[PDB]
Amino acid sequence: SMEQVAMELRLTELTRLLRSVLDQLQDKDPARIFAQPVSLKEVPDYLDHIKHPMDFATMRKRLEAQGYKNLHEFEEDFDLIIDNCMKYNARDTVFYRAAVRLRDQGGVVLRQARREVD
Numbered sequence: 588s589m590e591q592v593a594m595e596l597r598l599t600e601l602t603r604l605l606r607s608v609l610d611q612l613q614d615k616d617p618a619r620i621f622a623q624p625v626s627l628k629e630v631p632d633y634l635d636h637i638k639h640p641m642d643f644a645t646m647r648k649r650l651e652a653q654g655y656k657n658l659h660e661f662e663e664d665f666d667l668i669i670d671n672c673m674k675y676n677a678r679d680t681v682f683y684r685a686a687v688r689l690r691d692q693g694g695v696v697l698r699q700a701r702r703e704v705d
């Protein structure tokens with residue numbers, strides 16, 4: 588149907604917009620602290636602490652699979668990255684401070700993405 592095609596076109600362009608947003612957000616993490624899943628080899632008990640792990644690479648995989656239906660779902664995943672980090676790591680760590688900076692600096696980027704979506 589033309590309708591299903593039209594939807595897939597919207598979804599494809601949403602994916603295109605979110606891809607840009609993802610690249611911008613990841614630029615706010617120059618140290619690549621949030622680039623990959625927390626290694627269960629380097630941190631074997633992590634899953635006892637964090638029930639829903641998230642990272643930029645995992646977000647990217649979902650993105651290219653067009654697994655984000657709207658911005659809210661995308662923001663959910665970004666928020667997990669930040670919130671997980673700030674629970675697992677203590678306040679006076681390079682990890683926690685990185686999350687804070689990503690949170691603050693990403694707020695700008697998501698504020699406009701929200702408008703560009705409507």
Ligand SMILES: CNC(=O)c1cc2cccnc2s1
Pocket residue numbers: 620621625629630671672675676682
């Ligand atoms: C988002 N990444 C984290 O919260 C990490 C925490 C720790 C702790 C020790 C060694 N490596 C890592 S990575």
